[PDB]
Amino acid sequence: MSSLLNSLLPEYFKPKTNLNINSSRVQYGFNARIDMQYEDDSGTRKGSRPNAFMSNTVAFIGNYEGIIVDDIPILDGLRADIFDTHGDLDMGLVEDALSKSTMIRRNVPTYTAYASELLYKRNLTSLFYNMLRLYYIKKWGSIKYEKDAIFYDNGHACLLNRQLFPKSRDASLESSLSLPEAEIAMLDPGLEFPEEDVPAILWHGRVSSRATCILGQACSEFAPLAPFSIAHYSPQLTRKLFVNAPAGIEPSSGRYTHEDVKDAITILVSANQAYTDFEAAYLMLAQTLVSPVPRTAEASAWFINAGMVNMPTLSCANGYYPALTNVNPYHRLDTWKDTLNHWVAYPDMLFYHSVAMIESCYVELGNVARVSDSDAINKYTFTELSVQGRPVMNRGIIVDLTLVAMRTGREISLPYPVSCGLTRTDALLQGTEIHVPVVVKDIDMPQYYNAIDKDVIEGQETVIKVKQLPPAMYPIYTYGINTTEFYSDHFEDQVQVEMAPIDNGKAVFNDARKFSKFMSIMRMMGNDVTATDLVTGRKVSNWADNSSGRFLYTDVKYEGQTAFLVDMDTVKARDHCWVSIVDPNGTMNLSYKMTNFRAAMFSRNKPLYMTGGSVRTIATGNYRDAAERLRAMDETLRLKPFKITEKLDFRVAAYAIP
Amino acid sequence: MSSLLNSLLPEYFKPKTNLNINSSRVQYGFNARIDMQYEDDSGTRKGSRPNAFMSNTVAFIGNYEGIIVDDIPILDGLRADIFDTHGDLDMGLVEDALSKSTMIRRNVPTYTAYASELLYKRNLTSLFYNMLRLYYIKKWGSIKYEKDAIFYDNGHACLLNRQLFPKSRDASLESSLSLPEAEIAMLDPGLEFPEEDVPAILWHGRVSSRATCILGQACSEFAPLAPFSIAHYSPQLTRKLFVNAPAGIEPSSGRYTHEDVKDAITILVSANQAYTDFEAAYLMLAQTLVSPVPRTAEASAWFINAGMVNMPTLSCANGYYPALTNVNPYHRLDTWKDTLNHWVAYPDMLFYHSVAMIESCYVELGNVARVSDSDAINKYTFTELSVQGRPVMNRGIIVDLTLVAMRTGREISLPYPVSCGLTRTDALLQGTEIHVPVVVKDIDMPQYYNAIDKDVIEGQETVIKVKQLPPAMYPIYTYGINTTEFYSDHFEDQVQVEMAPIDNGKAVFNDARKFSKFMSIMRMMGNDVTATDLVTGRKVSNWADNSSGRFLYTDVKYEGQTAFLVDMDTVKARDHCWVSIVDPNGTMNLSYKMTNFRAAMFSRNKPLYMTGGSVRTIATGNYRDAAERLRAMDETLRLKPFKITEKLDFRVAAYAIP
Amino acid sequence: MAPIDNGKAVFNDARKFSKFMSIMRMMGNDVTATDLVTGRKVSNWADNSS
Known part of the structure; x- marks a missing residue:
């Protein structure tokens, strides 16, 4: 759904067509000006920060597993006359x-009996999902995963890719998968x-030598070596796949370019009228597509246990009964061909839509985690x-x-x-502390x-x-x-706090x-303050994340309560504007x-520039x-x-409820 | 009748088409929030169970025996001209x-003389009944029956499948029956x-190779090995069956799928104009289709002796008189095709209609068994x-x-x-003692x-x-x-047990x-109460079920006397999500x-989800x-x-566009 | 107090x-609080008359 995910991007940002990704890590942010x-x-005292870079980090590494499940039928593309009033x-x-x-x-009489059983299970979403993954493996097929690389690094603690991903080796994205080929047979009229448990799909003219190899590999099992987001383990869709092509199919070539996969998708959708099935897969x-790099070491608890990807069962009966698919198709929405028309024009735009979606989910789960389990809307009963x-x-x-709706409103x-x-x-829905494995870099790690x-x-x-x-x-x-109030992500805000009495050199x-x-003000001024929690006896620091300021x-x-x-004596001066003061007195007012x-955007500690022309709007x-x-x-x-x-x-x- | 069985289903229940049954036991119920x-x-002391599961276990096993009886003729189908006012x-x-x-x-002249006897032989209910059973045998064929399996178990008493069903070998439903084929001869015009005592049916065009195999097996003896509900014992309907098809009958194929049986039914009903015959068979x-697993150990008295199924004799004389059936038939009700049209669209909906009917009957036979014979509407004279x-x-x-009419009202x-x-x-009308066998687990059984x-x-x-x-x-x-007030199936209920401090917990x-x-609400609260009768000297426990609660x-x-x-100092906390009665003093007031x-729905101790399209209320x-x-x-x-x-x-x- | 806190209130x-400390003594409960800043202890049972 292009128009939905396109709305999530900020009003000032309009990205260009192409984006040459050449790494497994991309920083994205903005350069704002702050007048404190x-x-x-x-x-x-009056100051001004001329250039401040606030950014997240997103990667192409995420442990996922596929399961084949039975879902609802998508009744879009069938002729309008078979549907009643x-x-x-x-x-x-x-x-x-x-x-x-x-x-x-x-x-x-025979045709009607079989059609009644098959029409209530038609879904091509799982086939388009694998065909889309094959497109991006060939395009960005020069990304290196090193096993003894860093995942998170603060200074005190460190997580390697050996931990979080055992049973892994060093490989490129093209070298990760060695896909076999399923039998693409011809359906003689x-x-x-x-034949039961074999789908049949329509095709325009002759099935090309290259188109055979793509459909063969799309249906086959995915068995990766390196943990990659777009090469995750998926079960075998089907064994056979009939193709009702008037002209006979050609034997499989073995090799195909990323451009050839676009031609395969565009024909398969147009013939079968499976536009809504593509929107689901998109x-x-x-x-x-992308997974977050954690903000702090504690935020690695999300990505330990492998999340399950529910792939629908592959079934279709267009090849057997081509009379049901005609020139007057049934559609619920009139904007039912927008998502395909968007992808075929601008393929690389999916990266921006993916970053926009996973950000909205992982931001709002920050709030849902803090909700007490004794209210009407809680972690169990919010969906x-x-x-x-x-x-x-x-x-x-x-x-x-549901989380995108809660974010945007x-x-x-x-x-x-x-x-x-x-x-x-x-990871959220379980009342158990999670054991994140870490490496010790400095001797004073247990204090923090x-x-x-x-x-x-x-x-x-x-x-x-990690408990919460x-x-x-x-x-x-x-x-x-x-x-x-939690994030406090205002454009304009007036923070007011009353300073505690400094007895010796300590303020309670x-x-x-x-x-x-207090610590929110001192951070914006740029003062690295360190406090001691009295209950636990562990040192907290406002400079925890460097990326987001x-x-x-x-x-x-x-x-809990503490x-x-x-x-107040050991207040270091890391970043100093003219506003920045060390000794606060009475009631502190900061207006920025x-x-x-x-x-x-930054990739591999250099600026990543957008190429190509300007994106013109397509919308019905x-x-x-x-x-x-x-x-x-x-x-x-x-x-x-x-x-x-x-x-x-x-x-x-x-x-x-609003 | 699809219409009356549809109204029995609850308001909150929204059924889908497909139901993937993969076992011979289903726990249908609902999740409710109880505020005790x-x-x-x-x-x-307040409690709250957010997900409380009240279930009724339903199996695919049950001893039945068919007998051929004489029943009224169904005159719906014949042309409206020959009928009088x-x-x-x-x-x-x-x-x-x-x-x-x-x-x-x-x-x-010779055919007109016979008309007086042969035209009043119209009852195809027996044929449609057997053909419907063949559909479900081939669909749910992978369900298994083990010989040494647990029919019922409540901790104290256990009842095995060997006890109720002797002469029983373990086998799958598909491998249970080995049906021999009856002769399907072509009627010479x-x-x-x-030839009376030989039924002759009509057909549209040519009898297919698979239609011969289905009709051959439908008009034959069912001799099962495993005691399955949809594969019970039935006598031989007929030896030979004529088919008035000018296009010759093809010889028997041998094999057929469940979709080919739907093809055979739809041709037979359409040609013969027998829709009311199908409604009776439905x-x-x-x-x-399904028999209930007994709630208590002593509720197995219903399923000791085999209940007789009354199958009306197969008799049809349409083959001899093709002229009398045409496109303008005589029918009593206008909504006479509704039952077939419902089955063809949603075959798997019969499972929900079946459990709705047996639950309605066995509930009403519960509170019919507890009336004295000396009354107007009693055990013998309620029909x-x-x-x-x-x-x-x-x-x-x-x-x-008539039992469903009493339930719904x-x-x-x-x-x-x-x-x-x-x-x-x-077992009710007999009015004698029934001797159910049981294998003991504990040594303190015969007190309870x-x-x-x-x-x-x-x-x-x-x-x-078992007496009552x-x-x-x-x-x-x-x-x-x-x-x-017997079942006490209210949304809101309360009980007031009156005790004085002089009494040391003991209440009569x-x-x-x-x-x-009192005993029922204490079980919702998860408390194991054990009362003792003062007159007789027996004991009763509120925990006597693991389904309803x-x-x-x-x-x-x-x-006897009450x-x-x-x-109330021997009350033990058994379940989780429970309110505690540590030491009561004065009047107690319980409420939910x-x-x-x-x-x-549950099957094999896992959730069973409904899949497919949204079922509608089909009208004429x-x-x-x-x-x-x-x-x-x-x-x-x-x-x-x-x-x-x-x-x-x-x-x-x-x-x-323009 | 919230359920996330395991009995501990500041x-x-x-x-x-x-x-709080006074009414708990009427109810016949021996509470022993500990100051977080200094590290001393106080007990509500500090009298046998009032």
């Missing part, structure tokens, strides 16, 4: 439709009984209250699109309630991180405990579309909200303004030549948003 | 109709005198007063439909008073159950004496639509009604509230409006043009 | 700490 103004009891498939009219379009009327890949359709199960895409709508794709909320072994040596491999899941990403593209902050505001309360790494002892946003209106909006709002999936209502605690988040 | 409360002089065959118009036809002139199979027709004998479908209407199918009320021995070592085969039949199923689909229940509600008064297994001593309902009007429409768009290939439009680039072309 | 206010 400070006032306290001592006096006033309502949006329902009548078997009374299928008998009539097949009868009028043949001379041999002996086969009508005259066969009366459709959204399903937008989830998987069920949101959805207003009838899917098979609240899994895959339904979970992800708008009603998202799909034509069919499809439940296919990655489920992320697995909640480590098992309290005495360590540089080189030792230990384990750290912290935010994996900070808002960048979705910055200021709706501002929560008993309250939780005041402590968050902000302080979240989850950097304390202790759910009091902090801030060290953010202006002059401009998007910038609500009506072509349709008079009355026959609402048909019974079967269509609808996802209602939730607004965060702030309360006194500040540690707990709460959702309400 | 315990109020006392000391204070209130009253609605009976006016012989004289038959002789007129045969004379003005395409019949051989020398046969008219130039036959001198019609309701017959709805009774005897006679309800029935306002003229059936041959009050058996089969009449006894099952509505008027059930059928077009013909047909008396065919299973008779359930067999009314056993034949008083001391029994573990692993011994004993006998339980307890309810076999708890109401789940019919929950709080026609509520009785003089009333029987509130004893039942309720206490019915028939679990006492004795009718003096139940419950000691069920708020929302969600349909759930929804198809015949498309017949009124006719697709009246004159079938004329009108090709509309597209004017090319030039813009800035001129290299690429752009087409407009 | 009294930032001095006024309601006094009323």
